[PDB]
A paper describes a structure:
Herpesvirus-associated ubiquitin-specific protease (HAUSP, also known as USP7), a deubiquitylating enzyme of the ubiquitin-specific processing protease family, specifically deubiquitylates both p53 and MDM2, hence playing an important yet enigmatic role in the p53–MDM2 pathway. Here we demonstrate that both p53 and MDM2 specifically recognize the N-terminal tumor necrosis factor–receptor associated factor (TRAF)–like domain of HAUSP in a mutually exclusive manner. The crystal structures of the HAUSP TRAF-like domain in complex with p53 and MDM2 peptides, determined at 2.3-Å and 1.7-Å resolutions, respectively, reveal that the MDM2 peptide recognizes the same surface groove in HAUSP as that recognized by p53 but mediates more extensive interactions. Structure-based sequence alignment of the three HAUSP-binding peptides revealed a conserved four-residue binding motif with the consensus sequence of (Ø/E)-G-(Ø/G)-S, where Ø denotes a non-polar residue.
Author numbering: 64 to 104, 113 to 219, 222 to 501, 510 to 551
């Protein structure tokens, strides 16, 4: 019943003498009544109805479709069109008002009719729908998150599925604490339930630990910061525990920003750590072109001339260079910027392409054979709306096997590659802003095996008490 797609027919007898709208007998997909509609307007109507008879206002299903009119003389001569649409009561029906010229669907000389009967065919491609109890933990084995903290959910999951971090986090000494203050703890919950629950997991108490309340302290930052609040937070806690320095060992990299005055002999090198990488896009085509630009060399002149002390203002070069690329690579694409002419905080939906395999040791001044620097796509945080608000999802293939899933809040579905990748490449309206890549040699480690027997014990217990009390 809850199939992911299908095809169904509906034939209208006594057509020419038609006066009103005819609803077909329901076909089910994703557990929803998808019906066909035919009504004149002279032209021939053709739409697809979707669970229009349900009262509810809290439900939604997206879907592709092929409204097809069969040719009783040859199938390849049939006339059909394509439609994509978001369905929900207020707009439970989509299609075409001028689906075909009535004078052509009635010309007995070209098939479409026989006994003045016309046969309509509709191939629907349904996604998982919200507001209709979707047992994520069933046809995905993965559970979801509620609400939408905006981008926090995506980040949360993206993190949960960074296994090595997960175990390490579990193993924290979170006893002497206060269940509403302790972030590490407040995260140990999410992670735990995120694993054992069958019902949406409640961000609720985590959202408090940072202070990020009321939700404008969510729009007042971005993934990067949250990632850095949660993360950095968890380590000053892993600071004396057998799982010490786990985070940097997973996400940290050593960068180098330099300067070497052109005419005079003076250089200034500064290695800095880094837990992510902000890549530019506006004007670039793919990731490989972003790195190229990132490691381009900026000249200092005019007002930009370099402050050189005993040398005074001088002419120099300035640029950055990588020394090491983390095991886990957080790449944030800058699509969110401040327009010049407006006062607007605008989003750039231009087209940017990321690949499944990333070649990257050719951007370090010194590479190490035996241990290349090649990452593989692991997560794609998407966002929709040319507006700075909207909706946050996140695609992943948790065990890095190439098998994907969409974590749209409490609706985790199985999906194709071209849906997480080739589908989030901008658009000249819905796309990706962040990415997670894991190095090819450290995959198996970063994505270790999870067992109910990794979580402390006394922890499963504390998490238990609090869940008996009131």
């Amino acid at each position: 019943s809850w199939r992911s797609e299908a095809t169904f027919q509906f034939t209208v007898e006594r057509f020419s003498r038609l006066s009103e709208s005819v609803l077909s007998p329901p076909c089910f997909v994703r557990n929803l009544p998808w019906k066909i509609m035919v009504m004149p307007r002279k032209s021939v109507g053709f739409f697809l109805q979707c669970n229009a008879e349900s009262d509810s206002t809290s439900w939604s299903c997206h879907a592709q479709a092929v409204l097809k009119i069969i040719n009783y003389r040859d199938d390849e001569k049939s006339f059909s069109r394509r439609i994509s649409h978001l369905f929900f009561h207020k707009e439970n029906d989509w299609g075409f008002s001028n689906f075909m010229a009535w004078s052509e669907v009635t010309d007995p000389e070209k098939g479409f009719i026989d006994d003045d009967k016309v046969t309509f065919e509709v191939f629907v491609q349904a996604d998982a729908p919200h507001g209709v109890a979707w047992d994520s933990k069933k046809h995905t084995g993965y559970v979801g998150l509620k609400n939408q903290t905006c981008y926090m959910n995506s980040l949360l999951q993206t993190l949960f599925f960074t296994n090595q971090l997960r175990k390490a986090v579990y193993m924290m000494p979170t006893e002497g604490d206060d269940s509403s203050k302790s972030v590490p703890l407040a995260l140990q919950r999410v992670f735990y339930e995120l694993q054992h629950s069958d019902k949406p997991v409640g961000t609720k108490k985590l959202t408090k630990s940072f202070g990020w309340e009321t939700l404008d302290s969510f729009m007042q930052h971005d993934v990067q910061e949250l990632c850095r609040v949660l993360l950095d937070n968890v380590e000053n806690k892993m600071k004396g525990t057998c799982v010490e320095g786990t985070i940097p060992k997973l996400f940290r990299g050593k960068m180098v920003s330099y300067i070497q005055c052109k005419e005079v002999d003076y250089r200034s090198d500064r290695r800095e750590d880094y837990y992510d990488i902000q890549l530019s896009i506006k004007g670039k085509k793919n990731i490989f072109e972003s790195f190229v630009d990132y490691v381009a060399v900026e000249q200092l002149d005019g007002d930009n001339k370099y402050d050189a002390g005993e040398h005074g203002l001088q002419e120099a070069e300035k640029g950055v260079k990588f020394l090491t690329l983390p095991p886990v690579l957080h790449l944030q694409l800058m699509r969110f910027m401040y327009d010049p002419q407006t006062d607007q905080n605008i989003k750039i939906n231009d087209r940017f392409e990321f690949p499944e395999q990333l070649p990257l040791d050719e951007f370090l001044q010194k590479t190490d054979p035996k241990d290349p620097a090649n990452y593989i796509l692991h997560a794609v945080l998407v966002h929709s709306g040319d507006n700075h608000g909207g909706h946050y999802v996140v695609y992943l293939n948790p065990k890095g096997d190439g098998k994907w899933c969409k974590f749209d809040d409490d609706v985790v579905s199985r999906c194709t590659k071209e849906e997480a990748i080739e589908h989030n490449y901008g658009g000249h309206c819905t796309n990706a802003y962040m990415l997670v890549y894991i190095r090819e040699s450290k995959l198996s480690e970063v994505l270790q095996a999870v067992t109910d027997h990794d979580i402390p014990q006394q922890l499963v217990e504390r998490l238990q008490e609090e869940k008996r009390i009131e």
